[PDB]
Design a protein around this ligand. Structure first.
Ligand SMILES: CC(C)S[C@@H]1O[C@H](CO)[C@H](O)[C@H](O)[C@H]1O
Length: 461
């Protein structure tokens, strides 16, 4: 029973609210370690909590691996986005983070710690602004500014540290020394003047991916991503990811969940309570599966409930009602199907002869109000009005779940088991183009005309 409810505050095995905001995760041995920070009462750094788990749903409290007592500096400061990486050679765990005075944000510096054990008390080292000795000046202070940060371990066992420099306008990817505890050089200056923060660096199949989240304080914004074959250069443009608010959250870390069947990259972010005028500790979490259509095309769907099976390594949507359905048209007598039963995103939806195929089976997930989400079985995408069109003849396709109103449908009973399925965006019904009665009939969107080609019957399976 590994189901997670997004937009809420998870609870550990003890029954207490988990407090690991802006944190990350590490997979070592047989355990997944969730690190993160949380303010106390003065909105200052209290400690960096640590949770262990095997199922990724039931978390176990392990205490503060880093405390405000670990160092004199930590007695009064701001610490955000603490990440931990493993060093194969040494056998210890290096921890990076973002450090501030607690009075202001002039001290854009990073901080380092480490420990022989994962859930053990880390020993604070030093806070500093990278590249201090080079003598380079960044806004009046020694060393490049370093705010929003994150860590990454390449296949060749080389450590990397990413952070926002030059007033969060540029992203600096620093290459770490073999011990991961120091900066060896500035690998590359990525996305200059683009002003991206909250970076997440990962790799899949010889391709590096960089997930960002613009920069709009607490208020959620349009998240984007990019790819490249090399960390040094060859980076692509910023392609939009998720919706206009990243599903009311901000990216924090992305970890590959490997299992028996395969690997499913997990996305996790924060729904900062600051959005509605709340303390950091009241912030909620949002976990979603990061799907890869292709080596150059990424997908970040929004599932109100996510099911995870770490053992098999599968992250998919949780369907409250497993009841299958097929939508038969009154006029043609054919059922709703996906063109060529394809599972390619944005696939055209067409009518087809009832052949008991998977492509002709659909779930009905309630999404509030009198509207519902029509999801396919073979693929798992939702019925979507292409490009949120509000005009007649608007093609219907199956697209990644994005909580858009162009994916919510209301059923209006007209009798004899037939309904008029209207969209929540404009209110136009699901229409069979040109009253087609043959296979491959294009399913579209059209205003209510009282036609029989607009009436659909709900049939169990
Ligand atoms: C492309 C954006 C302006 S709208 C975007 O288009 C997609 C299909 O291409 C889906 O229909 C999404 O639901 C829709 O929001």
């Amino acid at each position: 029973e590994g189901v997670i409810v997004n937009g809420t505050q998870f609870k550990d095995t003890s029954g207490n609210v988990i407090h690991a905001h802006g944190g990350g995760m590490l997979k070592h041995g047989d355990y997944y370690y969730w690190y993160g920070e949380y303010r106390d009462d003065s909105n200052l750094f209290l400690g960096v909590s640590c949770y262990r788990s095997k199922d990724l749903v039931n978390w176990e409290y392990r205490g503060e691996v880093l405390s405000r007592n670990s160092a004199p500096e930590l007695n009064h400061c701001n610490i955000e986005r603490p990440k931990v990486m493993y060093n194969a050679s040494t056998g210890e765990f290096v921890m990076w983070m973002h450090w501030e005075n607690g009075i202001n944000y002039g001290q854009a510096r990073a901080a380092v710690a480490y420990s022989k054990t994962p859930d053990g008390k880390f020993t604070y080292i030093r806070s500093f602004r990278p590249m201090q000795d080079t003598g380079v000046m960044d806004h009046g202070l020694p060393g490049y500014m370093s705010r929003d940060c994150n860590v990454f371990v390449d296949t060749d066992g080389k450590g990397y540290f990413i952070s926002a420099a030059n007033e969060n306008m540029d992203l600096h990817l620093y290459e770490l020394t073999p011990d991961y505890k120091n900066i060896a050089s500035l690998k590359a200056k990525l996305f200059v003047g683009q002003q991206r923060e909250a970076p997440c660096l990962i790799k899949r199949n010889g391709y590096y991916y960089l997930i960002t989240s613009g920069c709009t304080g607490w208020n959620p914004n349009q998240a984007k991503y990019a790819y490249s074959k090399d960390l040094a250069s060859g980076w692509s443009q910023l392609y939009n990811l998720g919706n206009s608010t990243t599903y009311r959250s901000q990216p924090t870390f992305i970890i590959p969940v490997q299992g028996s069947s395969g690997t499913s990259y997990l996305y996790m972010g924060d729904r900062w309570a600051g959005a509605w005028g709340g303390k950091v500790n009241d912030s909620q979490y949002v976990w979603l599966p990061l799907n890869f259509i292709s080596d150059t095309t990424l997908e970040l769907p929004y599932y109100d409930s996510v099911k995870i099976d770490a053992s098999s390594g599968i992250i998919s949507e949780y369907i409250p009602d497993t009841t299958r359905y097929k939508l038969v048209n009154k006029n043609s007598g054919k059922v709703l199907d996906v063109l060529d039963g394809s599972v390619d995103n944005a696939a055209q939806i067409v009518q087809w002869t009832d052949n008991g195929s998977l492509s002709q089976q659909w779930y009905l997930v309630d999404v509030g109000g009198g509207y519902k989400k029509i999801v396919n079985v073979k693929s798992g995408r939702a019925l979507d009005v292409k490009d949120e069109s509000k005009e007649d003849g608007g093609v219907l396709i199956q697209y990644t779940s994005n909580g858009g109103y162009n994916q919510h449908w209301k059923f209006t009973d007209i009798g004899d088991g037939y309904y008029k399925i209207s969209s929540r965006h404009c209110g136009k019904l699901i229409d069979v183009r040109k009253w087609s009665t043959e296979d491959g009939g294009i399913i579209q969107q059209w205003s209510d005309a009282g036609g029989t080609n607009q009436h659909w019957k709900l049939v169990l399976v």
